Amino acid sequence: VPAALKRLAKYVIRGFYGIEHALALDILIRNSCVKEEDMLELLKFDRKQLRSVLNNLKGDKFIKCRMRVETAADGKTTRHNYYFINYRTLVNVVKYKLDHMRRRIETDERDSTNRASFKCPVCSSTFTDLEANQLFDPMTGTFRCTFCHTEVEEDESAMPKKDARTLLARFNEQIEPIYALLRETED
């Protein structure tokens, strides 16, 4: 394994996945062709626990399997499952999630700035900006409601408004320093 593929495969398995997925990968890095019974005696895991961890890597298009049908000394059919780190698919799978994780923040932010900005703190009614021509009272200079005469306020300060947008927009820029060590190596 090259120095770029070995360093990239170790940083992803630690931060993203759990600890059980990283302990079963260190043996696959030092040794490629590893038998199925070797990862159970060295790691001291369980038959049902190790199978659930290996299925998560195989399901994520990371490693494959090469079955063998031969004959042992006793005369029975012996089947093995050789698991090795296959870099012929893992390269595009990592880049596939990076495009959706980057667009998920942009979609949730674009679909949150355009909503509303008026709410009555009495009747708890979420109003919009397209009803200011009918909810205005010229005898007082302020806004009112429909079925009652109460004063409205904002709309629960939590959405990216004129000033709160900078706080939520800079959260996306924090992904660059935490991933620059992993993106520059793959680039």
């Binding site: 980057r102 900078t166 927009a169 996306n172 820029e173 660059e176």
Partner: protein, 52 residues
């Protein structure tokens, strides 16, 4: 790239390397994100002074 600053959005250069940047007449550099974000909020005013 990111050392010159950014007007309104401020979070655009770190999202796409191949970003479409534009220029004006007074002497500034505004990307394509600040063009649509400022039009829906105001119009075509200079973020530092007053250039229509």
């Amino acid at each position: 790239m990111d050392d010159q600053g950014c007007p309104r959005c401020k979070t655009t250069k770190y999202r796409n390397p191949s970003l479409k940047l534009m220029v004006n007449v007074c002497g500034h550099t505004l990307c394509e994100s600040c063009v649509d974000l400022l039009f829906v909020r105001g119009a075509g005013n200079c973020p530092e002074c007053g250039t229509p």
